[PDB]
Coordinates of C-alpha atoms and ligand atoms in Angstrom, one line a residue:
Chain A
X10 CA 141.7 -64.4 -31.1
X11 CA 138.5 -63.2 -33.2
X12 CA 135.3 -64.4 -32.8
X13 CA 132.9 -65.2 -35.4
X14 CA 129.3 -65.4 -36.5
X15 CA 128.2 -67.9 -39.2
X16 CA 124.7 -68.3 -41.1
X17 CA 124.7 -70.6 -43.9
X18 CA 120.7 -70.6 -43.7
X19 CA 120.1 -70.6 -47.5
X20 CA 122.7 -73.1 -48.5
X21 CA 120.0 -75.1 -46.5
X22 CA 116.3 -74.6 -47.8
X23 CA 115.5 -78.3 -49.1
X24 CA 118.1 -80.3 -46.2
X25 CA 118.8 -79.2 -42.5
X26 CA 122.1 -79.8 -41.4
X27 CA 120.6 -80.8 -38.0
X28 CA 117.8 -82.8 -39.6
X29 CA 120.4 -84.8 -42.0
X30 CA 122.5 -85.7 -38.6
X31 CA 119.5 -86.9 -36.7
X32 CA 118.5 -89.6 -39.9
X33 CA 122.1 -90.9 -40.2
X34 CA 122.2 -91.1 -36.4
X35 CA 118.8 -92.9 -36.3
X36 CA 119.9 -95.3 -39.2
X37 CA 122.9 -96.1 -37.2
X38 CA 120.6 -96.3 -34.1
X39 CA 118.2 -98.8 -35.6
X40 CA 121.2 -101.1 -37.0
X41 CA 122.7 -101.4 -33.5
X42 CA 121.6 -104.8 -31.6
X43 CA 119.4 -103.5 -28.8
X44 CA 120.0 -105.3 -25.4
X45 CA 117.4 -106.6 -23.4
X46 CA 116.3 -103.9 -21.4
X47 CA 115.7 -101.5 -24.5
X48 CA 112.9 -102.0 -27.0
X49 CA 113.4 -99.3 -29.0
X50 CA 115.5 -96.3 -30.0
X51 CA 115.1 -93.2 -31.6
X52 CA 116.6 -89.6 -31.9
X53 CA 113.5 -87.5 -31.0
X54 CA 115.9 -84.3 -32.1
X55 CA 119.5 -83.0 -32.5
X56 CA 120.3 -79.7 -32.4
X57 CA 124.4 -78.3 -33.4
X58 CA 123.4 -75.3 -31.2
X59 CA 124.3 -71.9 -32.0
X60 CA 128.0 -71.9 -29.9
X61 CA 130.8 -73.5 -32.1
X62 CA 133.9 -74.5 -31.6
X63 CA 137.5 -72.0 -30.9
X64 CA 139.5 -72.8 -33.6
X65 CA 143.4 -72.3 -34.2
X66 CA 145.1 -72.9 -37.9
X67 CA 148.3 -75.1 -36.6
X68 CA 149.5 -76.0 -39.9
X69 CA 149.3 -75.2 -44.1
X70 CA 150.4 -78.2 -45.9
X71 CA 149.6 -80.4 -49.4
X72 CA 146.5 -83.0 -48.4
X73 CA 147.7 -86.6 -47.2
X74 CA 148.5 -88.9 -49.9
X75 CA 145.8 -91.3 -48.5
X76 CA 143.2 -89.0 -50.3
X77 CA 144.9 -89.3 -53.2
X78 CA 144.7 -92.8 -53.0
X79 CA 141.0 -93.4 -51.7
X80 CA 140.0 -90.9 -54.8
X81 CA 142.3 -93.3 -57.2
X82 CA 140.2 -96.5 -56.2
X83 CA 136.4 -94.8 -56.6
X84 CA 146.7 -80.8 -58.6
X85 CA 149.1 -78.1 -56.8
X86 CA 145.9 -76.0 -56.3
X87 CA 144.5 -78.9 -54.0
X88 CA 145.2 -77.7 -50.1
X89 CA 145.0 -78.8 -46.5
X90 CA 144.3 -76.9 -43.3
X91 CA 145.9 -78.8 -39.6
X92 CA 143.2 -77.2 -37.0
X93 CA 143.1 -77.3 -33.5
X94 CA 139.6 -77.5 -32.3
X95 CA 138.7 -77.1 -29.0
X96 CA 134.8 -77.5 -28.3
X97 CA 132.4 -76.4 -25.4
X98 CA 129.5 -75.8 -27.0
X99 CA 125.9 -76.0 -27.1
X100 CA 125.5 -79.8 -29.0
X101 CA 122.0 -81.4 -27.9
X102 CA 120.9 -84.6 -28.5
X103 CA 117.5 -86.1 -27.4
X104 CA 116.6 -89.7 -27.8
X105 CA 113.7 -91.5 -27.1
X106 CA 113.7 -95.1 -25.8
X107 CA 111.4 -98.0 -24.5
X108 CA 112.6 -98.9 -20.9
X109 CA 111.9 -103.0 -21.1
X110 CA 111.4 -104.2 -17.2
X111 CA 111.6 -107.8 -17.3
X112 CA 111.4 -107.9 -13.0
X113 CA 109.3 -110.5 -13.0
X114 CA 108.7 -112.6 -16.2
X115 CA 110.3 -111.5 -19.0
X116 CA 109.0 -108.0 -20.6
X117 CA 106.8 -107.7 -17.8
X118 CA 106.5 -103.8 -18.4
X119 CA 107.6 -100.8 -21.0
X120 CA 108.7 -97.1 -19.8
X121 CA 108.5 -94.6 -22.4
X122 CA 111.7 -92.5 -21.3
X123 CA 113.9 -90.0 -22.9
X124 CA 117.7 -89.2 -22.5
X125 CA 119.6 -86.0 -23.5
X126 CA 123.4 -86.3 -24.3
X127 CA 124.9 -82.5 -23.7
X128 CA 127.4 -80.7 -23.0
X129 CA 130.3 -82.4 -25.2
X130 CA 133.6 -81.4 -24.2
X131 CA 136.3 -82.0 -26.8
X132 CA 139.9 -80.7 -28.0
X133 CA 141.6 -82.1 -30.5
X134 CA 143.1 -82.2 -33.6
X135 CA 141.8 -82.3 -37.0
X136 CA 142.6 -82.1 -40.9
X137 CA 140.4 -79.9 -43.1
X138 CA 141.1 -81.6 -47.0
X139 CA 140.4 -79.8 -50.6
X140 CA 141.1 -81.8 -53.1
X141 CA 139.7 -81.6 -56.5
X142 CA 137.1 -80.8 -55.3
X143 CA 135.7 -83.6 -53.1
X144 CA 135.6 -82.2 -49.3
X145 CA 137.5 -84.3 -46.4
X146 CA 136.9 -83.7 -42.6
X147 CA 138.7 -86.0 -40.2
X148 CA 139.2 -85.7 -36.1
X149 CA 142.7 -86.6 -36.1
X150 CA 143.8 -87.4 -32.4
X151 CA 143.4 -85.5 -28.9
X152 CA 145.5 -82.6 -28.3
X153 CA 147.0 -84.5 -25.6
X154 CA 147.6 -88.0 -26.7
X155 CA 150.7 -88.9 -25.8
X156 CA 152.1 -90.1 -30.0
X157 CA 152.7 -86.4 -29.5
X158 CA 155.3 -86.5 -26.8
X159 CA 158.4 -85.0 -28.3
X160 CA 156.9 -82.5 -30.5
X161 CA 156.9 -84.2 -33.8
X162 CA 154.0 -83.1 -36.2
X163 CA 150.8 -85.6 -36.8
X164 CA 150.8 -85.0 -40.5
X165 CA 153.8 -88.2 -40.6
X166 CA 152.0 -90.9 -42.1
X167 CA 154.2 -94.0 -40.8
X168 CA 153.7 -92.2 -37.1
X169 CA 151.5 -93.8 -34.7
X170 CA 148.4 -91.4 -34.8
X171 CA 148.3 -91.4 -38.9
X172 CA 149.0 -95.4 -39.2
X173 CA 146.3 -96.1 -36.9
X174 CA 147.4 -99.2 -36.0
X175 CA 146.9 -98.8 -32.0
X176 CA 143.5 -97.1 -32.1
X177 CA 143.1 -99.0 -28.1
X178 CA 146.0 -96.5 -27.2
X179 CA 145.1 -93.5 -28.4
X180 CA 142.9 -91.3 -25.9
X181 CA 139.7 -90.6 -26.8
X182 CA 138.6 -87.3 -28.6
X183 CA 135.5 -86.9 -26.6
X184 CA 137.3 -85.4 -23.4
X185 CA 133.8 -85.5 -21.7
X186 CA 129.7 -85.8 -21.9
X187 CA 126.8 -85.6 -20.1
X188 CA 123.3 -87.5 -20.1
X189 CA 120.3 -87.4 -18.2
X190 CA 117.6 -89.3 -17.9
X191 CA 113.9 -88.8 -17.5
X192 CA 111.0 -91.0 -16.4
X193 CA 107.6 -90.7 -15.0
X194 CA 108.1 -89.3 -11.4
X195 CA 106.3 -93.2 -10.2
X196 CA 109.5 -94.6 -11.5
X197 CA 112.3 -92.6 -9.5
X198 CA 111.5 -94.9 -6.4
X199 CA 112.7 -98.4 -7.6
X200 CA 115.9 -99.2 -8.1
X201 CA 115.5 -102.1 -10.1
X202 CA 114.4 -99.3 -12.8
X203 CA 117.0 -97.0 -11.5
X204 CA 119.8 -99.7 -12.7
X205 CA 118.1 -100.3 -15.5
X206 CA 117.6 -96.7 -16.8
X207 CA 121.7 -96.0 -15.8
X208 CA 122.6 -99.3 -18.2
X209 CA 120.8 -97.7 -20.9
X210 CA 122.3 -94.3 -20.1
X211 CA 125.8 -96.2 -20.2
X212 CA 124.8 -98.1 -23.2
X213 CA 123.6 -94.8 -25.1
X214 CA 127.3 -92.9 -24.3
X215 CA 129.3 -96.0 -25.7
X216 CA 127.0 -96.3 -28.7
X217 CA 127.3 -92.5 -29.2
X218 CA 131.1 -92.3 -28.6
X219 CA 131.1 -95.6 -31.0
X220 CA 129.0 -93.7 -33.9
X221 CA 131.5 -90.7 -33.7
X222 CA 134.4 -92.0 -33.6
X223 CA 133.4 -94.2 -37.1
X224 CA 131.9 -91.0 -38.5
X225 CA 134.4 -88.2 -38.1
X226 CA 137.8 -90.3 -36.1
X227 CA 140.7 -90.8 -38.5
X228 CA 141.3 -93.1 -40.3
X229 CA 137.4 -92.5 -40.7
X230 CA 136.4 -89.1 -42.3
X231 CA 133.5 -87.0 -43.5
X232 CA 133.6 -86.9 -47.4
X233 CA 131.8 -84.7 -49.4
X234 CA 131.3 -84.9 -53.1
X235 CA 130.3 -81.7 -55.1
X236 CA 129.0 -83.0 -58.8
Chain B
X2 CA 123.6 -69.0 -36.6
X3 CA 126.2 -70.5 -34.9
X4 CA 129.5 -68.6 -33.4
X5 CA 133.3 -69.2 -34.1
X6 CA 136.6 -67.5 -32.3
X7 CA 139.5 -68.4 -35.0
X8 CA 143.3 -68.0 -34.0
X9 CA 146.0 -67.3 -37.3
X10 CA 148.6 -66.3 -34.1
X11 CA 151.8 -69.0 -36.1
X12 CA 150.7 -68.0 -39.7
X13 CA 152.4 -65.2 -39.1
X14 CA 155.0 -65.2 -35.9
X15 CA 157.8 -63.1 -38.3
X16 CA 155.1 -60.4 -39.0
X17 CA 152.0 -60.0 -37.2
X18 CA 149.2 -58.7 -39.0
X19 CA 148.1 -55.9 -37.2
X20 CA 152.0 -54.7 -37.9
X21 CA 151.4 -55.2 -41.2
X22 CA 148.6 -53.6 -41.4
X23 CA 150.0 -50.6 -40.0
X24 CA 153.0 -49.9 -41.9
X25 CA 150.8 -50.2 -44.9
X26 CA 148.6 -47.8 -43.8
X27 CA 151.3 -45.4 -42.2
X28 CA 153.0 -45.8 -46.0
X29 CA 149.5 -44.5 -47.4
X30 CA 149.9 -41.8 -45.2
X31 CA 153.0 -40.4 -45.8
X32 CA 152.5 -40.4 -49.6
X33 CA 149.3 -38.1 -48.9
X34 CA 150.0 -34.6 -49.1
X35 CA 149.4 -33.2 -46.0
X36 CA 147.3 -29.5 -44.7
X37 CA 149.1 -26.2 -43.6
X38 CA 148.4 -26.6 -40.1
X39 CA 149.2 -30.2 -40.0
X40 CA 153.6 -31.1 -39.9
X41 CA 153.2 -35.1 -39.2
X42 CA 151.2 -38.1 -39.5
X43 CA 152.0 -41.6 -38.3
X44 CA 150.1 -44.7 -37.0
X45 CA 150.6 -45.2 -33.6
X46 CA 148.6 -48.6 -33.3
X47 CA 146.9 -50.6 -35.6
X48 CA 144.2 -53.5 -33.6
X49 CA 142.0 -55.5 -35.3
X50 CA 141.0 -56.5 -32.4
X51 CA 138.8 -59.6 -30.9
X52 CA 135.4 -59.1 -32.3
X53 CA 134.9 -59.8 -36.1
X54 CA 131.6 -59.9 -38.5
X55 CA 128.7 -61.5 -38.7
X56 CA 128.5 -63.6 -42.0
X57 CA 125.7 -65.0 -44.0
X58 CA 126.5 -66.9 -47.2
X59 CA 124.4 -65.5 -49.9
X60 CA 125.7 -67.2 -52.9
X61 CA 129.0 -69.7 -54.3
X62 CA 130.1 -69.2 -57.8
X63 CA 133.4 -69.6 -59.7
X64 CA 135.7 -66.3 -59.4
X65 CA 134.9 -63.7 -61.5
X66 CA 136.8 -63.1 -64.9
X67 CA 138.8 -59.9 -63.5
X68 CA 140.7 -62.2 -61.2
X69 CA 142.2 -64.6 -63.9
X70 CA 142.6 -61.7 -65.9
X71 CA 144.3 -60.4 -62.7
X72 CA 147.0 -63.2 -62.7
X73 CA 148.7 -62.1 -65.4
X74 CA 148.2 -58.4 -65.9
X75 CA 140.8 -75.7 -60.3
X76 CA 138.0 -76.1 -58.6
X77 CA 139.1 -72.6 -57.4
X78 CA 136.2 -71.0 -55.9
X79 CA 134.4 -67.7 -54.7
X80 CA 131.8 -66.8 -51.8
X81 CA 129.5 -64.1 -52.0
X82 CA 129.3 -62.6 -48.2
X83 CA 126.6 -60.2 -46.3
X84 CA 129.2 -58.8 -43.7
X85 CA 127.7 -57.0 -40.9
X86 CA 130.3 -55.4 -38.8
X87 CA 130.2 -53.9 -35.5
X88 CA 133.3 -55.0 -34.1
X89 CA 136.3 -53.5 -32.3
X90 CA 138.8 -52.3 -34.9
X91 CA 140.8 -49.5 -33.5
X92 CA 143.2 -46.9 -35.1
X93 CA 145.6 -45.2 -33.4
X94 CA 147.3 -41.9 -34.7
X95 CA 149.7 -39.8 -34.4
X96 CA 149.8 -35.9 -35.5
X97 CA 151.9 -32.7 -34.9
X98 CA 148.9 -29.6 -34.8
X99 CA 150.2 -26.0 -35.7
X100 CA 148.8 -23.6 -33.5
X101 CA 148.4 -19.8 -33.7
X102 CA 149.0 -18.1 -30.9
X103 CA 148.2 -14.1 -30.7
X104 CA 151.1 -11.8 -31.3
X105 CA 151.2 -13.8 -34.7
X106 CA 152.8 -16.8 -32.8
X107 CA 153.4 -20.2 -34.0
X108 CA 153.7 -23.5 -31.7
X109 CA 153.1 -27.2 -32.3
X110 CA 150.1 -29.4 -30.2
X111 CA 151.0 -33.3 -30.6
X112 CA 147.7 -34.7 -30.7
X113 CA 146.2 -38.4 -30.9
X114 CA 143.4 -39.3 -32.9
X115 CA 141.5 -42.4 -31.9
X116 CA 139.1 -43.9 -35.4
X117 CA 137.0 -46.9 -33.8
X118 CA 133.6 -48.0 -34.0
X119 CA 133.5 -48.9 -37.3
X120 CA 129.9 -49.5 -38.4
X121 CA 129.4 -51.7 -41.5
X122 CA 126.9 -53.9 -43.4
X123 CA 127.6 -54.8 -46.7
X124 CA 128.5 -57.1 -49.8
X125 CA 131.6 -58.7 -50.3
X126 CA 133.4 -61.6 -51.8
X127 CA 136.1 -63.8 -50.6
X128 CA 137.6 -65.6 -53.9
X129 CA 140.2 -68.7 -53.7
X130 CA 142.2 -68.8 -56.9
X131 CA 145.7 -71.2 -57.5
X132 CA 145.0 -70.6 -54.7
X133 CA 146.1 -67.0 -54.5
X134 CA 143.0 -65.7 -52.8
X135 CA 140.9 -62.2 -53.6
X136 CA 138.8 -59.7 -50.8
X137 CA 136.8 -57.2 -51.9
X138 CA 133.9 -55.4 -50.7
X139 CA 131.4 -55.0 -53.5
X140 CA 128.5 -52.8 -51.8
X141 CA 126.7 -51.3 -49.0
X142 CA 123.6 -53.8 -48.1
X143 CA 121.2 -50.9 -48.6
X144 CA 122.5 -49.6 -51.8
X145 CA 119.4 -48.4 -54.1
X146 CA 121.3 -49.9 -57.5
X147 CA 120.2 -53.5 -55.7
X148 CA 116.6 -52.5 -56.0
X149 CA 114.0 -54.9 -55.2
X150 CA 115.3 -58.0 -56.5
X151 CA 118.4 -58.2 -58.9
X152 CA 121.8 -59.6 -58.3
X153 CA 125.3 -58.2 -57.9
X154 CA 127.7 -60.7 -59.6
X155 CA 125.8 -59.5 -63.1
X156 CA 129.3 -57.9 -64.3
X157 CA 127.0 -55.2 -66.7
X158 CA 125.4 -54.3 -63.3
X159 CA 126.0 -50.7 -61.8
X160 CA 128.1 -51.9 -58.9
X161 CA 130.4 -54.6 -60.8
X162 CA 130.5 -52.4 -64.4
X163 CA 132.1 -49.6 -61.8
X164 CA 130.0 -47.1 -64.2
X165 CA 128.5 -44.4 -61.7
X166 CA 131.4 -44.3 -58.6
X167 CA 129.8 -41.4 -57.4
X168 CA 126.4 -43.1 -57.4
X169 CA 126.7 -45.5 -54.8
X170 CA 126.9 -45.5 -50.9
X171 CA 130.2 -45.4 -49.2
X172 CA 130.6 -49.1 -47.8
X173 CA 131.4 -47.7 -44.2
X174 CA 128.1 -46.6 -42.6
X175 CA 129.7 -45.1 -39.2
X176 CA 133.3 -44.4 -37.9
X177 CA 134.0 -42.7 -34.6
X178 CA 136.7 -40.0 -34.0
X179 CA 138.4 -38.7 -30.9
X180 CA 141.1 -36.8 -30.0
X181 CA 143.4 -36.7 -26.9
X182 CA 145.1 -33.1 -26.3
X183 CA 146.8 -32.9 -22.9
X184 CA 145.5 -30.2 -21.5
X185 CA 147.1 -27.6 -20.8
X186 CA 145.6 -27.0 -24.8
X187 CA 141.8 -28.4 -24.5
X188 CA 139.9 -25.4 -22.5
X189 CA 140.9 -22.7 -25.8
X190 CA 139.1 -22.6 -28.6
X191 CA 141.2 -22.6 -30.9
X192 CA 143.2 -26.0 -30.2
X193 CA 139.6 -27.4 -30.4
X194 CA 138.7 -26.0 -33.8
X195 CA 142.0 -26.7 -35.1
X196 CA 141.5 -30.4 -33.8
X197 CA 137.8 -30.4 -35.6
X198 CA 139.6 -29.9 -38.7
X199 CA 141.7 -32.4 -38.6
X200 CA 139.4 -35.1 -37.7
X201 CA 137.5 -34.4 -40.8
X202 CA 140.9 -34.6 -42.9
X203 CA 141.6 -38.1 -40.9
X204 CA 137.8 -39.1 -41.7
X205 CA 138.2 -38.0 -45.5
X206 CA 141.7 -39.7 -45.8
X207 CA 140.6 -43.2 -43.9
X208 CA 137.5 -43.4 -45.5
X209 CA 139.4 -42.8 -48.9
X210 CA 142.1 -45.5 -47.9
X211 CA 139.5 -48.0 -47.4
X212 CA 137.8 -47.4 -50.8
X213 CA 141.2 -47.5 -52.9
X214 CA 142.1 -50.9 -50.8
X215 CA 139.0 -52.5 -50.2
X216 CA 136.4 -51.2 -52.5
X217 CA 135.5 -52.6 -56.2
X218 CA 137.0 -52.9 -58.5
X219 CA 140.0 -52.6 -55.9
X220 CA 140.7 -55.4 -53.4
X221 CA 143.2 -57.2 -51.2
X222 CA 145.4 -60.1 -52.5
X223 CA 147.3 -62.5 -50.9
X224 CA 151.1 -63.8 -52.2
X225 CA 152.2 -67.2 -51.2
Ligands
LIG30 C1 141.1 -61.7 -41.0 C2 139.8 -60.8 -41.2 C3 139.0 -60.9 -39.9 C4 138.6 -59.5 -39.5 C5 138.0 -58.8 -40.6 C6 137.2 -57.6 -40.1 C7 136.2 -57.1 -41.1 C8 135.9 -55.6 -40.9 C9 137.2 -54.8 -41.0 C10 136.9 -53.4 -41.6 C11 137.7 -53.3 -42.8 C12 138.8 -54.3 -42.9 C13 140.0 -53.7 -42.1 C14 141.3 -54.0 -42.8 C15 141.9 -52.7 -43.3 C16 142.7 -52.9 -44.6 C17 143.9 -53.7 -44.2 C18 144.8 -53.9 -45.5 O1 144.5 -53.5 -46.5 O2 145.9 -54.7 -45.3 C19 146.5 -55.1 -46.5 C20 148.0 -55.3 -46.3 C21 148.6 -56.0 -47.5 O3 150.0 -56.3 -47.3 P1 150.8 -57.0 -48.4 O4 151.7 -58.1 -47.8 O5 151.7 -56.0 -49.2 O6 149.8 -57.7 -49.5 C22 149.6 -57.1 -50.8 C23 149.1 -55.7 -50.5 N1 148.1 -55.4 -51.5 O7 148.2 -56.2 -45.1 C24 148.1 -57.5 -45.4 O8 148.5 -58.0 -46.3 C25 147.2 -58.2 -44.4 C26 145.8 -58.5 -45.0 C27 144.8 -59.0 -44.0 C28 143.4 -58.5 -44.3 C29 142.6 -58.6 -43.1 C30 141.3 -57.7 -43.3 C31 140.4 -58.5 -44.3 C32 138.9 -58.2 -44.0 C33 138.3 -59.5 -43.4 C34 137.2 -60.0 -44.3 C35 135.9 -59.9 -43.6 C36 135.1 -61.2 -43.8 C37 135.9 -62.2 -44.8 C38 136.6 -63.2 -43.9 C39 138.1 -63.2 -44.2 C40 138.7 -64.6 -44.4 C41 140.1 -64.6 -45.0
LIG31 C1 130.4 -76.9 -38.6 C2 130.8 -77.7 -37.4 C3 130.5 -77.0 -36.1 C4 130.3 -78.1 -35.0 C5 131.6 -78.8 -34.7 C6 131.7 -79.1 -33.3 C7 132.1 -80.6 -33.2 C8 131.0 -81.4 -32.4 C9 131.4 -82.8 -32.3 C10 130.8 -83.6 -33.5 C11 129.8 -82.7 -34.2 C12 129.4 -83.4 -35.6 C13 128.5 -84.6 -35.4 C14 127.9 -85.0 -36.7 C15 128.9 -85.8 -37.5 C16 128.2 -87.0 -38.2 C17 127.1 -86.4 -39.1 C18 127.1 -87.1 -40.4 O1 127.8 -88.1 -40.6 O2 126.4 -86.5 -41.4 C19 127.1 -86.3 -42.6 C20 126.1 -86.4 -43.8 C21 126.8 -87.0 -45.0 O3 127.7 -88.0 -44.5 P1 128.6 -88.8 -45.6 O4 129.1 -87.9 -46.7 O5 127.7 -89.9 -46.3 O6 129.9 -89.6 -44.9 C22 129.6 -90.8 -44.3 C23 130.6 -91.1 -43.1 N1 132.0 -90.9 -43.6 O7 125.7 -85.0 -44.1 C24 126.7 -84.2 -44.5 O8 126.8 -83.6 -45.5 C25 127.8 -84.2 -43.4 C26 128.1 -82.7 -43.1 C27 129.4 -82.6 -42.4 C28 129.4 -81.5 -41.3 C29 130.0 -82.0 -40.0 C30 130.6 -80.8 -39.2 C31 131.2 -81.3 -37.9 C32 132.7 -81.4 -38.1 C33 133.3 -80.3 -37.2 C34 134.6 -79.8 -37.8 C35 135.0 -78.4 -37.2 C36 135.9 -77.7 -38.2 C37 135.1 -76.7 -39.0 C38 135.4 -76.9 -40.5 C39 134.1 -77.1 -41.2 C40 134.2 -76.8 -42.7 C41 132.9 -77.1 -43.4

């Protein structure tokens, strides 16, 4: 319907939304066992971008009673918002990694390369949670995942999407993603550097996907506490 | 920074909003006492339409003391908004002209007055209370009372005291009219002047409605 422009630039003088994503992302990074053909990774930048996501309210309700209960281990007023999200915008992120060719002998040579993952596609559904007054965020399920055959709402906690007992069948909320790769213009010849720079791309969407669906994927969710 | 479209479209699938919107303005218009040479006025079409306002958060506090005052008369909460509009908001209306002919003759000229453009760029604050929520534009971005550096949630402040109405810039910085005569009425003069007039009545009276619905110390709130 209507579009929207959003600046929250002061609420951000001392901590950058996109610098505070690119140190968790490198923490998780750097606790991730590296395979053999990677010696190191880093997030060189992220960047939200300045396109965000269409978003339609779907449902008003009271928040999920696991809230509750996660506040109860460590109010009518409290609310929750059901939102679908649908996303095609302008997400960047570039990380730097050492190539390790091990072609002959093992770590014969290092590539400095760098990859970008872009252009996320994405449309789902998610919860938006105030609840005295601790924030909750949480990608709920794809918009198309089929525990919604039948047209019966997400919010029931014994159905499948809420229980999350089969998180193998439920489709994934990244629709789609891209990465590139580049390396010194010497390198785009061999293939045995080829394959390996495609194994790290591989490895790099999988540990990404991983990282977000841990983050912000329900049962997992984004809490913020405000004392 | 970064850019949002939001849908409400099943919040409301009884009423719509730019329905409801338009009977309440088209109630504010019948209880105005109208000119002479004016018989009827009635909104034709109300449109929000599909481009809304830049926003910059400027500050987050806890409500102000009018509004819990006003629910009898948490954590709730309440944003402090720079608003800069320049979207596509159009009015639609409706009104019966009364001509004078020579030969001391008398005629009606349906007429329909197009208000759109809507230029704005102001302060305003969006308050969430249990949870019954509070809009109101509090002041032009440019108004001298905010001189240099001083804030507008100080309550014995010129803007939030209300003191000096008079004082302060109108919160709409540009509007645009037009009319559409079929013409076998737009080449005389007359028809034209008559049509002048009543734009400025239209700009007067919607400039007025905004103030008395929008403006502190009035504002919108929400029932639920
Ligand atoms: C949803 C807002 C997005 C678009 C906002 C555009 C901002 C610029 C628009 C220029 C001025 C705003 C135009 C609105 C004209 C006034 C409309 C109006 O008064 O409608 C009130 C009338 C009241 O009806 P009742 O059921 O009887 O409720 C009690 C009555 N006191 O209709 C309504 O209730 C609908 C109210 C919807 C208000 C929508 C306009 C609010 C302005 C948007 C705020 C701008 C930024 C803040 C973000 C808003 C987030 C909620
Ligand atoms: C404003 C969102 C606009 C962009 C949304 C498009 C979706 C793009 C796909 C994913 C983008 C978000 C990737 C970053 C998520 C991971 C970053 C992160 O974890 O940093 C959070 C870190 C603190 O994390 P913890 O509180 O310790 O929680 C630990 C894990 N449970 O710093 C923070 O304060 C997190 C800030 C949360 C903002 C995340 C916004 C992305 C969610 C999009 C939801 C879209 C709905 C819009 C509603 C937003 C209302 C605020």
């Amino acid at each position: 319907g209507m579009s929207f422009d959003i600046n929250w630039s002061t609420l951000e003088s001392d901590n950058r939304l996109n610098d505070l994503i690119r140190k968790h992302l490198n923490s998780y990074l750097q606790n991730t066992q590296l395979p053999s053909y990677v010696s190191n990774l880093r997030v060189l930048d992220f960047d939200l971008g300045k396109v965000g996501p269409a978003i339609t309210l779907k449902e008003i309700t009271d928040p999920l009673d696991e809230f509750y209960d996660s506040i109860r281990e460590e109010s009518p007023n409290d609310i929750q918002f059901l939102l679908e999200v649908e996303y095609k915008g302008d997400l960047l992120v570039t990380i730097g990694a050492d190539l390790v060719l091990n072609y002959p002998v093992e770590k014969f040579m290092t590539l400095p390369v760098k990859l970008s993952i872009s252009d996320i596609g994405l449309h789902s559904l998610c919860i938006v949670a105030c609840l005295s007054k601790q924030l909750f965020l949480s990608f709920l399920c794809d918009v198309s995942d089929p525990a919604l055959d039948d047209n019966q709402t997400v919010l029931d906690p014994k159905g499948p999407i809420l229980a999350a007992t089969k998180p193998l069948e439920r489709i994934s909320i990244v629709r789609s993603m891209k990465i590139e790769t580049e390396i010194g213009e010497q390198y785009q010849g061999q293939g045995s550097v080829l394959r390996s720079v495609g194994e790290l791309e591989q490895f790099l969407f999988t540990i990404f996907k991983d990282f977000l669906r841990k983050e912000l994927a329900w049962p997992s969710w984004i809490n913020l506490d405000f004392n």
